[PDB]
Amino acid sequence: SDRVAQLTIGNSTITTQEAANIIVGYGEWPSYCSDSDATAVDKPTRPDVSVNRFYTLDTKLWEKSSKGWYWKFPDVLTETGVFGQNAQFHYLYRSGFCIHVQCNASKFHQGALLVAVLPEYVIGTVAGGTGTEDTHPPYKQTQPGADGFELQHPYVLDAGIPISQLTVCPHQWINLRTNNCATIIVPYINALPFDSALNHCNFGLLVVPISPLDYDQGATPVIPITITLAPMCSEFAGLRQAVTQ
Amino acid sequence: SHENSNSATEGSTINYTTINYYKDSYAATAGKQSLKQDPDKFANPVKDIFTEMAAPLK
Amino acid sequence: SHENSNSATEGSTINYTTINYYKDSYAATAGKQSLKQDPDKFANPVKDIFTEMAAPLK
Amino acid sequence: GDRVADVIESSIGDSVSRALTHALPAPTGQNTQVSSHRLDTGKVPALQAAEIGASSNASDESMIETRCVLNSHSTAETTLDSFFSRAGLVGEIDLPLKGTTNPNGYANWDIDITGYAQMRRKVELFTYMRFDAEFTFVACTPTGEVVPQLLQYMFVPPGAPKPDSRESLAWQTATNPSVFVKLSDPPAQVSVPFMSPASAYQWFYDGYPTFGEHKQEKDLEYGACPNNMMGTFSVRTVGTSKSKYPLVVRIYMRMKHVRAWIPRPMRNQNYLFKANPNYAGNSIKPTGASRTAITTL
Amino acid sequence: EIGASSNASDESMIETRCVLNSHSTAETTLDSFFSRAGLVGEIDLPLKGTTNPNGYANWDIDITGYAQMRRKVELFTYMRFDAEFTFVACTPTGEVVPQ
Amino acid sequence: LLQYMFVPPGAPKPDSRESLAWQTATNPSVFVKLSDPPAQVSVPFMSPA
Amino acid sequence: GFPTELKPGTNQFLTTDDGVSAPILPNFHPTPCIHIPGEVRNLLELCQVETILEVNNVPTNATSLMERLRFPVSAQAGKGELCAVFRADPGRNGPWQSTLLGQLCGYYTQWSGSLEVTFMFTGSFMATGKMLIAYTPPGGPLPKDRATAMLGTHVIWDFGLQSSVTLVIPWISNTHYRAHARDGVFDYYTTGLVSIWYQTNYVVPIGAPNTAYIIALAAAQKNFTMKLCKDASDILQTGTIQ
Amino acid sequence: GFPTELKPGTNQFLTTDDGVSAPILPNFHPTPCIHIPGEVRNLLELCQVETILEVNNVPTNATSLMERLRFPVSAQAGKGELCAVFRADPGRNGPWQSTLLGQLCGYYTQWSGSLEVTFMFTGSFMATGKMLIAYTPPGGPLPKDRATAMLGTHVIWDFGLQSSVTLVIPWISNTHYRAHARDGVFDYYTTGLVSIWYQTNYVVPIGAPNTAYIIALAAAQKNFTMKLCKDASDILQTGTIQ
Amino acid sequence: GFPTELKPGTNQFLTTDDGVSAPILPNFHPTPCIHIPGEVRNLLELCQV
Amino acid sequence: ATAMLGTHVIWDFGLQSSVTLVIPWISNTHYRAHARDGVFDYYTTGLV
Numbered sequence A: 001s002d003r004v005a006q007l008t009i010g011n012s013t014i015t016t017q018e019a020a021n022i023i024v025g026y027g028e029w030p031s032y033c034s035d036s037d038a039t040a041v042d043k044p045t046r047p048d049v050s051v052n053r054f055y056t057l058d059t060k061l062w063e064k065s066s067k068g069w070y071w072k073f074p075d076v077l078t079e080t081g082v083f084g085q086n087a088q089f090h091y092l093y094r095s096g097f098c099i100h101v102q103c104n105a106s107k108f109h110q111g112a113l114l115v116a117v118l119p120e121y122v123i124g125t126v127a128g129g130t131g132t133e134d135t136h137p138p139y140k141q142t143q144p145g146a147d148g149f150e151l152q153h154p155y156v157l158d159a160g161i162p163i164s165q166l167t168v169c170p171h172q173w174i175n176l177r178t179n180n181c182a183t184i185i186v187p188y189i190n191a192l193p194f195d196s197a198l199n200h201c202n203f204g205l206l207v208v209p210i211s212p213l214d215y216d217q218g219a220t221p222v223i224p225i226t227i228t229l230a231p232m233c234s235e236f237a238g239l240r241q242a243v244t245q
Numbered sequence B, C: 001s002h003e004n005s006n007s008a009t010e011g012s013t014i015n016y017t018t019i020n021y022y023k024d025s026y027a028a029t030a031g032k033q034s035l036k037q038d039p040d041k042f043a044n045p046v047k048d049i050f051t052e053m054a055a056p057l058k
Numbered sequence D: 001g002d003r004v005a006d007v008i009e010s011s012i013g014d015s016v017s018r019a020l021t022h023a024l025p026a027p028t029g030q031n032t033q034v035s036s037h038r039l040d041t042g043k044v045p046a047l048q049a050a051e052i053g054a055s056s057n058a059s060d061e062s063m064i065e066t067r068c069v070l071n072s073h074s075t076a077e078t079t080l081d082s083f084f085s086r087a088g089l090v091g092e093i094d095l096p097l098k099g100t101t102n103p104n105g106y107a108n109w110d111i112d113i114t115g116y117a118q119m120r121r122k123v124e125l126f127t128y129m130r131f132d133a134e135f136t137f138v139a140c141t142p143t144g145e146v147v148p149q150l151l152q153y154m155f156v157p158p159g160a161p162k163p164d165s166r167e168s169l170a171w172q173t174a175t176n177p178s179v180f181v182k183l184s185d186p187p188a189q190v191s192v193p194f195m196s197p198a199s200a201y202q203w204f205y206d207g208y209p210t211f212g213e214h215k216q217e218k219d220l221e222y223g224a225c226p227n228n229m230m231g232t233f234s235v236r237t238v239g240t241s242k243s244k245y246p247l248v249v250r251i252y253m254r255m256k257h258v259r260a261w262i263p264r265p266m267r268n269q270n271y272l273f274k275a276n277p278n279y280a281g282n283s284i285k286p287t288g289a290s291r292t293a294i295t296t297l
Numbered sequence E: 001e002i003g004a005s006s007n008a009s010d011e012s013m014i015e016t017r018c019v020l021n022s023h024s025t026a027e028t029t030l031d032s033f034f035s036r037a038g039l040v041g042e043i044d045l046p047l048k049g050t051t052n053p054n055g056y057a058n059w060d061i062d063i064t065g066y067a068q069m070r071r072k073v074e075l076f077t078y079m080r081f082d083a084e085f086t087f088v089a090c091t092p093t094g095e096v097v098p099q
Numbered sequence F: 001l002l003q004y005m006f007v008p009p010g011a012p013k014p015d016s017r018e019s020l021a022w023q024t025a026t027n028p029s030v031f032v033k034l035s036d037p038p039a040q041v042s043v044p045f046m047s048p049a
Numbered sequence G, H: 001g002f003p004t005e006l007k008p009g010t011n012q013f014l015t016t017d018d019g020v021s022a023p024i025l026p027n028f029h030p031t032p033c034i035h036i037p038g039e040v041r042n043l044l045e046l047c048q049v050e051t052i053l054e055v056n057n058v059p060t061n062a063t064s065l066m067e068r069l070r071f072p073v074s075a076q077a078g079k080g081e082l083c084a085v086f087r088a089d090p091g092r093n094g095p096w097q098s099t100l101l102g103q104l105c106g107y108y109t110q111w112s113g114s115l116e117v118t119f120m121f122t123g124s125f126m127a128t129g130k131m132l133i134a135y136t137p138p139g140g141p142l143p144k145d146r147a148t149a150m151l152g153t154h155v156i157w158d159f160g161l162q163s164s165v166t167l168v169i170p171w172i173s174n175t176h177y178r179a180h181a182r183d184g185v186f187d188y189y190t191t192g193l194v195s196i197w198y199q200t201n202y203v204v205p206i207g208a209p210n211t212a213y214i215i216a217l218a219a220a221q222k223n224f225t226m227k228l229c230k231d232a233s234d235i236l237q238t239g240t241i242q
Numbered sequence I: 001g002f003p004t005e006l007k008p009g010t011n012q013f014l015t016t017d018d019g020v021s022a023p024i025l026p027n028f029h030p031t032p033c034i035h036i037p038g039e040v041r042n043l044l045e046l047c048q049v
Numbered sequence J: 001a002t003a004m005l006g007t008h009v010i011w012d013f014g015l016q017s018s019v020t021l022v023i024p025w026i027s028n029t030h031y032r033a034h035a036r037d038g039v040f041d042y043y044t045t046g047l048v
């Protein structure tokens, strides 16, 4: 009754029989931009059901040696469905998100994934190892698209900060013996009412194994982790031709 | 007084008690803040809240 | 107070809120002005005013 | 006018963000209530499910037999203004005589406080911050001496001409704010408002400032947000001839009227550059002290 | 040709939303624009020099010798105002002496 | 010009005239000239007892 | 005396400090102020007055300077050809520098609001035509053709009795205010582009000139405001003014 | 003028002095503040959020750093063996340094209140077991065996559907506040020790791993407060930051 | 500024002067005072023993 | 990734042995005649 759940939005429905409740980031639901917070004067387009629905974008294989991965929002969706088209044709964009990370195993497997949302997730480099080289991460690493990107040094989240404190951000854990999914709802987070879906990633989604996957020889060894997400209250403005970047 | 309301906290949820001698309120002192807190926003942002006595998952 | 009214803006259309410690008011601060505006004086000084919806010449 | 039912019963446009939590007054630490032994089935405070994402709701009262304690310990020193409204070093400017850097008697400092670790680590605990500030300027010679020298400090906002010499026409300062002060006078001090075009400054910006291809040579602009670039602070000795003494100006910042949003993990690796979170890959150290075994102190 | 500026507004040229604009107009008042001190004169009192080697000097009160200030006031034809004058003195190197 | 800094138990004690600890971002410091009058401040009752 | 204690800031001269100073002429009364026409109260009043936009900012020799004030249109070959383009950024180097708006704008660090450009056709009464004027919000590159430009905010202008048309450049920004845009990271504040295309063609009968000019007038809308007073980028003096 | 007399303190610059300073931009109004989620008001709000406690703070080479976040349990030989131990002192070098509580704690000289550590078992669903987690108040040395540990404050944890259990480290101090404890006379402020023992055993059937991990999450109770603002013991910079 | 004029005594440090000094720890609250036996209020109390 | 763009259900195995996929009536006409290869594919319902 807290372990069972159904998420329906648009023409898509998700079910789970081993949930661990739902986290509503920073305690607030996504909402549209008010007339006093807004600044741009054109009437926005709010496509509703054609863009606020669940999109299943990627599947990673969890292995005994996996380090963890991250995806950037709204980057992961800029090239998918009607949402992507709207993000490309418009300068301004804003929306919340319902993130549903899936991973099931068996009552004989074990392991725990930390699933968290970190706003303004700026990536850093190892500065040439010695720290004397002022290198910078390449476009494919800051905005990895739907494939996401694997963490090089998970302990410092590839940004000089402790993953041990990542739980200060909206999160859930997928502890195989307990649940098979994580559900996090995130409201729009920015210091501006609207922004570019292309130039700015509002937050990053991190999926990192803290307690390594394990099982005995003979149990299914392929344990996928799938990422499904839905925009909520999407709004777009500043219409012109489509632009991919 | 009869000054400009240009302080960074103008229109904040908590009220301050400050001192100033100029027409611009951002010149004012830091003062005393209101002592409100909302731990749940970070420590308990769950949709369906569970009790202390209950078993969290059922 | 009970000072001389020798400020450059004495008898102006807008009222100021200033500070002073001397008997001559021109020694006072600049203060805050009144926020009135009259763009039409420069942007629309036509004798017979026309609407937005209308065709300016007919 | 509307007519089809789905439009009428629509929630499209709701601008009021529903909040699941609300703030309560808490001037002192919570009190402790008398508790006694509980030998129940069904009631189980100690058992939790961290997977949910919430912190434990178990309290002292339900884990052990407690007495009553009237706690009047204040919570006032942990407010944002208490924590941040303490002036710290955020910039340093050198005006040497015969030197490599500024041998012309003037200097331009880019207003960025991320060059000093103490202050930087504190503000980086939050993602967005909005605040006013009090800046204090302490000037003296490299030995800490005070000499009879007159200086001019000028704030040059983005778009205003930056002085290119001790005699630049820009020092006429007809619109920019300037401060004229002697090294012998007490430290100059002024109040600065919240000047960003955004509702808040942000210590982290995961994105690019412009559109286009983000090729190798432009990757230096990843994470650069103009909403954080408030301008230049220029200083010069006031004269047409070179000054007789070498000077140093230390810049202290004291935030006030602070608001902050979205807390984040605190920096645990040394800082290398102002513009980014780069860390030395060959020296990734644990966050704290270590020991030889998990079963020994 | 009429001589007036266009009266067309955002609302009638495109479909607009509602925006509650609370951006202040206070910094563009004449006092805000002009009540900032700027350099308008400079006087030299040299020792052994060409100009004032006698230890005194007469400055004709005219602020048009400096471009920044001059360009600002010349935006208007007539101006009426009070003023605060500040005098900063030092040696040519910026030194302060007991004089 | 001198700098006085109060370093509570647990804060890093400066080990030189150029120690990073003088950044004084949280500890209270006083900057004063020998020519200024004596520096003077109020201190509260700080014991844990 | 009364116990006081001097604080930092003591003795400093802050040029924008609004304090009180001793009066030099006690009991002096100024000449009364008679009525004078055209008093201005706020610079914003001036920002709403249209001034000529030098879209054609290319000629530079003294004898051709007046040509910057107008640009041409003429009979084409109906391929929806491009007539002219320019950045909409008002506080940026370029065409807007000729306008009073652009200049006043130079004394402020940030601005916010919609702009408007009114185009006046000065060809003969017998000349007709339809032009497409488009505003491309940030992110959209210079439109390669008319079909691309048409996807943004635009106006289709028909020549006739009303000599002019107004293109409104609505405030479409991510931030509440924009600082002056320029090449580099500050292009983050760019306003966008304006392009003019031939919708149909400039048509004329026998006896009328095949080339005519358009004069562009620009100003700000009533939602326009500016903030953070700063010095202009130009200082119009070389050596000392004697 | 009005008779005044300067007092000591005159001209000094006290970094924590909360005074008034002349404003540099008169009549300037800031950008309005829109709504932004997650505003924080008091650091105490953050101290109540659990962060990972590195009980297993032993591995130090880069490739093994992630192992500090969890410690193991496995099938034993039922002699009530010791699993792990650590000091409860939150502002002391050790495991607590990995927590946000420990770090924020570093900016204050004194603290007061109860703490809590929640342990999450991440073994397979088929694994069972009972652990005894004990808190030994000041004065009691590291318990030599489980029978000694059991005499202090403790919890007996049973693995099951609820993956986690919480050990409350109740505020048991002689003084109202504790300063940061460390070796030497300041051990006077030590909080105590926490030891984990096998109450029964980690049992598993054929087919499930013989070793699993426990993740520890720590934070402060609602009676927790801190006082006397000070600088943290670390300064994360070597030379100048460029 | 407001017209003032410094008088003799200016800048002096009188050890018994009972004045006000800037506080070094803003918003700091001391440990509450529990009850302790034998509080003394006036030295005269001791002179009678 | 292509299938996911249409109407769908994500089924999780567990105590409830079954799941239901609803094939909602999404047609241009009020009624469909029996679909078959040829011009009558005009009445096709779609794919699962």
Ligand SMILES: CCO/N=C/c1ccc(OCCCCCN2CCN(c3ccncc3)C2=O)cc1
Pocket (backbone or CB within 6 Å): D111, D112, D113, D114, D135, D153, D154, D155, D177, D178, D179, D190, D192, D201, D202, D203, D204, D228, D230, D233, D274, H024
């Ligand atoms: C007479 C001249 O006196 N004016 C002095 C003055 C002092 C400070 C000043 O502006 C100080 C603004 C401080 C903002 C610091 N911030 C804002 C966010 N930010 C930042 C830096 C690097 N990355 C992201 C954000 C910063 O470094 C303006 C004028």
Ligand SMILES: CCO/N=C/c1ccc(OCCCCCN2CCN(c3ccncc3)C2=O)cc1
Pocket (backbone or CB within 6 Å): E061, E062, E063, E064, E085, G024
């Ligand atoms: C103890 C002596 O202190 N008095 C100082 C003082 C300073 C200024 C002062 O009068 C300043 C009047 C400023 C008027 C400037 N104006 C008026 C218009 N104007 C002008 C110049 C050139 N062409 C046309 C007009 C000017 O240059 C008188 C005394």
Ligand code: NA
Pocket (backbone or CB within 6 Å): G020, G021, G022, I001
């Ligand atoms: Na005076």
Ligand code: NA
Pocket (backbone or CB within 6 Å): D189, D190, D191, G008, G009, G010, H020, H021, H022
């Ligand atoms: Na001041």
Ligand code: NA
Pocket (backbone or CB within 6 Å): F040, F041, F042, G005, H008, H009, H010, I020, I021, I022
């Ligand atoms: Na004092």
